[PDB]
Amino acid sequence: RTGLAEDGAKSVYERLKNDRAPYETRAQNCAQYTIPSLFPKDSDNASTDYQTPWQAVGARGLNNLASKLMLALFPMQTWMRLTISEYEAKQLLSDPDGLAKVDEGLSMVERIIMNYIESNSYRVTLFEALKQLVVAGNVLLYLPEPEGSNYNPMKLYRLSSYVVQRDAFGNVLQMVTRDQIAFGALPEDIRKAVEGQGGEKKADETIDVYTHIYLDEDSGEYLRYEEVEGMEVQGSDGTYPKEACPYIPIRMVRLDGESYGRSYIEEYLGDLRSLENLQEAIVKMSMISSKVIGLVNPAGITQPRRLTKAQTGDFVTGRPEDISFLQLEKQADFTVAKAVSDAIEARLSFAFMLNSAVQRTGERVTAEEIRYVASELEDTLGGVYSILSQELQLPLVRVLLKQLQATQQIPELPKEAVEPTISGRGQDLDKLERCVTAWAALAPMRDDPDINLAMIKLRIANAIGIDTSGILLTEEQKQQKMAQQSMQMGMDNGAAALAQGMAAQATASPEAMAAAADSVGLQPGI
Amino acid sequence: AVSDAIEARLSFAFMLNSAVQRTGERVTAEEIRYVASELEDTLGGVYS
Amino acid sequence: ASTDYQTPWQAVGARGLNNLASKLMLALFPMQTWMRLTISEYEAKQLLS
Amino acid sequence: PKEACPYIPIRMVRLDGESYGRSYIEEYLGDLRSLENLQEAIVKMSMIS
Amino acid sequence: PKEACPYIPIRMVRLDGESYGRSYIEEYLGDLRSLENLQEAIVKMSMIS
Numbered sequence: 256r257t258g259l260a261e262d263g264a265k266s267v268y269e270r271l272k273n274d275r276a277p278y279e280t281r282a283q284n285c286a287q288y289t290i291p292s293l294f295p296k297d298s299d300n301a302s303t304d305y306q307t308p309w310q311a312v313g314a315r316g317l318n319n320l321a322s323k324l325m326l327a328l329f330p331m332q333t334w335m336r337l338t339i340s341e342y343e344a345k346q347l348l349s350d351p352d353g354l355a356k357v358d359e360g361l362s363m364v365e366r367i368i369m370n371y372i373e374s375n376s377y378r379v380t381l382f383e384a385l386k387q388l389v390v391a392g393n394v395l396l397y398l399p400e401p402e403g404s405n406y407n408p409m410k411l412y413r414l415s416s417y418v419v420q421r422d423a424f425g426n427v428l429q430m431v432t433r434d435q436i437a438f439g440a441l442p443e444d445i446r447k448a449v450e451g452q453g454g455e456k457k458a459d460e461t462i463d464v465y466t467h468i469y470l471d472e473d474s475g476e477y478l479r480y481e482e483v484e485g486m487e488v489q490g491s492d493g494t495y496p497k498e499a500c501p502y503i504p505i506r507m508v509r510l511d512g513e514s515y516g517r518s519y520i521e522e523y524l525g526d527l528r529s530l531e532n533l534q535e536a537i538v539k540m541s542m543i544s545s546k547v548i549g550l551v552n553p554a555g556i557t558q559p560r561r562l563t564k565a566q567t568g569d570f571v572t573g574r575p576e577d578i579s580f581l582q583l584e585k586q587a588d589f590t591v592a593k594a595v596s597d598a599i600e601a602r603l604s605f606a607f608m609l610n611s612a613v614q615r616t617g618e619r620v621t622a623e624e625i626r627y628v629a630s631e632l633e634d635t636l637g638g639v640y641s642i643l644s645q646e647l648q649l650p651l652v653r654v655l656l657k658q659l660q661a662t663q664q665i666p667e668l669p670k671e672a673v674e675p676t677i678s679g680r681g682q683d684l685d686k687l688e689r690c691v692t693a694w695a696a697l698a699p700m701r702d703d704p705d706i707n708l709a710m711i712k713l714r715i716a717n718a719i720g721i722d723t724s725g726i727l728l729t730e731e732q733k734q735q736k737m738a739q740q741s742m743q744m745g746m747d748n749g750a751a752a753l754a755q756g757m758a759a760q761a762t763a764s765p766e767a768m769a770a771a772a773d774s775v776g777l778q779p780g781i
Numbered sequence: 782a783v784s785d786a787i788e789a790r791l792s793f794a795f796m797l798n799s800a801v802q803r804t805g806e807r808v809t810a811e812e813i814r815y816v817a818s819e820l821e822d823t824l825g826g827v828y829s
Numbered sequence: 830a831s832t833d834y835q836t837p838w839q840a841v842g843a844r845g846l847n848n849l850a851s852k853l854m855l856a857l858f859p860m861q862t863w864m865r866l867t868i869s870e871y872e873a874k875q876l877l878s
Numbered sequence: 879p880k881e882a883c884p885y886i887p888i889r890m891v892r893l894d895g896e897s898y899g900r901s902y903i904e905e906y907l908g909d910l911r912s913l914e915n916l917q918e919a920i921v922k923m924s925m926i927s
Numbered sequence: 928p929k930e931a932c933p934y935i936p937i938r939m940v941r942l943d944g945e946s947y948g949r950s951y952i953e954e955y956l957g958d959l960r961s962l963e964n965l966q967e968a969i970v971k972m973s974m975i976s
Contacts, residue, residue: 277831307908311790322822382829525836541783545919588976595973602840610819622811634851784916787909838966842959
């Protein structure tokens with residue numbers, strides 16, 4: 256292999272491993288103050304015990320932020336829509352009816368995409384990825400090629416399992432993932448290379464498998480291969496388009512000239528560290544005050560020998576003044592520490608969008624003030640997931656669209672369909688529903704002889720901004736509706752008139768009365 | 782005070798409804814609804 | 830990539846910047862159409878009947 | 879089959895490279911121990927009183 | 928064209944005779960510095976306490 260892949264997948268992984276080390280260090284520091292097990296250190300193993308952080312806002316705001324991001328980015332309602340360019344489409348077909356049929360097909364496609372997302376537990380993996388992005392700012396999502404309708408969950412790579420190199424322009428030049436798969440669990444093609452390499456390995460032996468995705472010099476495309484023991488696996492070679500690469504590296508906070516992203520917790524790690532210091536001291540002061548020490552005055556006359564051997568209700572020589580208890584006298588410092596603890600925890604709660612900010616530490620709270628400031632949390636919600644639509648949502652749809660077309664799970668796209676991820680169809684619903692409410696107001700003036708109601712309906716629809724093609728009935732369709740309406744009375748009046756006359760002839764005479772019987776199969780004599 | 786403070790944050794982590802009940806003082810029904818929504822949202826995190 | 834950004838001692842600046850940028854975004858680029866194409870009414874009427 | 883094994887091992891909190899999962903309680907066991915210490919001392923004080 | 932250049936340099940606060948704009952934050956940076964000083968001292972007093 257030439258270009259970026261000359262050295263090999265494993266060696267590229269080690270050279271870029273040192274570059275990602277500062278991000279791993281920050282992720283471990285960020286995890287330490289929120290949820291230590293979220294980003295464990297490399298040396299951590301089954302015997303590692305993760306201490307509970309001295310303060311709670313870090314873990315609490317971490318869980319809150321990931322769920323709120325998940326709700327906004329991946330709600331139950333469709334969060335992507337397939338959009339066809341309105342002018343280019345109308346240039347290819349001749350009637351608005353087909354254009355609605357085009358939107359029906361696009362609506363079906365995104366229904367299939369969501370059904371595929373739910374049936375493959377993408378929401379489970381996305382929430383794990385979102386938690387990683389808040390503490391580490393980095394996660395790699397791999398979407399395996401779907402084999403039929405089988406369960407195909409996407410693989411999540413933590414920052415410690417992959418490296419990505421990115422130029423200052425922001426292009427992913429190359430990226431290597433490390434998979435530690437047992438010999439038994441290896442796929443056949445990877446296993447054949449391991450046996451082909453030499454040696455007899457136990458089924459439980461761990462194999463380092465490296466997948467190297469690098470930008471090709473020719474065509475500006477991504478070349479992909481899997482390497483084991485420094486040897487490329489036969490059949491692991493492949494090609495992915497630049498915009499449809501299944502390995503998606505997501506950055507929570509992106510800085511120019513940096514290959515990896517920054518985490519959200521890192522922006523507030525200073526507050527968490529200082530709140531950790533205050534919270535630890537406050538709890539440790541309570542541990543001191545928890546100890547009971549009876550201070551006996553040696554200038555006094557009370558003997559603990561008599562006190563401890565006494566029963567309840569016993570009369571004993573002594574004075575209450577000679578017996579005292581060691582107490583922690585730090586209330587002035589305790590109030591200062593608690594005040595700054597509350598002050599930092601309050602602003603950390605707002606930064607983590609915790610509803611303690613609306614709840615406040617104390618005093619009375621009114622409902623209406625909460626709603627307006629709740630909007631502020633929903634507004635600052637917009638800023639935190641803003642690049643996640645471009646970093647995560649949009650490539651996720653692009654890879655899925657190409658993969659589902661390859662497996663024919665969706666029909667082949669017209670090649671002119673664009674997909675925006677909008678928290679779309681709901682916007683068109685609001686426009687349509689406003690038109691009906693505006694139009695329903697025109698019903699009082701239905702019989703008005705002065706105002707051109709058709710003209711007003713067009714202006715109302717146009718001012719809303721909806722596409723007006725086909726909403727107004729054409730002259731031919733108006734003629735058909737009148738004809739269909741006229742036929743309805745024509746058929747209905749005819750059916751009543753015909754049956755009445757037919758009944759009259761059937762009952763005209765007893766002789767014809769028998770004729771009706773023999774016709775239907777009845778018999779006069781019974 | 783520290784026992785009430787630790788029990789308060791443990792109550793929120795365990796989805797306990799005493800968290801919205803608070804240590805003391807008066808509460809408002811509409812405010813209780815919003816903070817109870819936060820508990821149900823963080824609830825979704827643990828069974829994901 | 831090795832630079833550590835210390836959290837500012839006050840939080841209003843980070844809170845203020847995020848709120849301002851978000852509030853500007855809703856005002857300038859909302860979900861509703863924020864630009865309109867307008868044709869000069871007299872000039873258009875001088876061209877169509 | 880790999881996908882339809884009747885024996886289902888469930889992990890509450892799964893960590894990379896671990897055969898078993900972590901519990902949810904152990905993330906807050908530190909606060910539980912500290913509250914345990916306070917609650918024991920508070921009750922034992924009442925027993926002296 | 929002079930009116931349709933794809934490179935758009937945007938200035939938040941425009942001053943006459945200046946090639947670049949001023950930030951909106953710098954209008955209030957003095958109050959941010961003063962509050963930074965107070966917030967640093969308040970936290971550090973708590974650390975002493």
